[PDB]
Design a binder for these strands. Structure first.
Length: 204
DNA sequence: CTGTCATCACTGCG
DNA sequence: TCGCAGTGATGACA
């Protein structure tokens, strides 16, 4: 296997194609059958005083007895299902990193997206990495430095762009989520779904 | 309880 | 098609 080291000021991530095509295809099929996504209130978000649907489907799974915060609410993730344990075990076996929680984001096509944000959701263990595993359609991913955002940014730190491919792993290491925001921009020419899994080590 | 800070995705452009 | 500029109610935190 080959790893691409992604490096910039305050940015430390690693990228590899972790699952081969055949295995990644099988995993994607099973995820599409089995993952149960949020409906109702959890699929709505208020932004600048206006209510919208979250522009992607979401779900959480994790170890028994864990709780987390999802927009002002204390929730329990769903118990692990085998396909998720399979993915987690391969990531852990390869990297030596351990996780007890996963957030799943499903992008139905290129019109589903996520805006600039940090995973400084800190139900997280201090300094622990997040493993971002992708299945389905390739989608463009963008890292932007915290001081390079908006109309008149204080600094002009170069944007880091890469596509996240089917079966890929992007390890995001501290302090990436302190100094950088990431996003998945709208790509209208993408017609196929993508499932992204971000494995995390959350506090007990 | 109070005040500062970060936050999320859309519309309406260009 | 892409992406910038402008839009605030709400929770975390000390």
């Amino acid at each position: 296997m080959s790893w691409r080291h992604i490096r910039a000021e305050g940015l430390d991530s690693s990228y590899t194609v972790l699952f081969g095509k055949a295995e990644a295809d099988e995993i994607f099929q099973e995820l599409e059958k089995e993952v149960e996504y949020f409906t109702g209130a959890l699929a709505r978000v208020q932004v600048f005083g206006k209510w919208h649907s979250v522009p992607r489907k979401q779900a959480t799974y994790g170890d028994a007895g864990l709780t987390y915060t999802f927009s002002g609410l204390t929730l329990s993730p769903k118990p692990w299902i085998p396909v998720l344990e399979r993915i987690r075990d391969h990531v852990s076996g390869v990297t030596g990193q351990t996780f007890n929680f996963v957030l799943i984001n499903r992008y139905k096509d290129g019109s589903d997206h996520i805006c600039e944000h940090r995973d400084d959701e800190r139900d997280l263990a201090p300094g622990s990495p997040i493993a971002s595993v992708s299945f389905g359609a390739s989608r463009d991913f963008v890292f932007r430095h915290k001081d390079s955002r908006g109309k008149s940014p204080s600094r002009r730190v170069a944007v880091v762009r890469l596509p996240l491919a089917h079966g890929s792993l992007l390890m995001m290491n501290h302090p990436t989520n302190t100094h950088w925001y990431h996003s998945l921009p709208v790509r209208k020419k993408v017609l196929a779904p993508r499932v992204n899994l971000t494995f995390r080590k959350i506090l007990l």
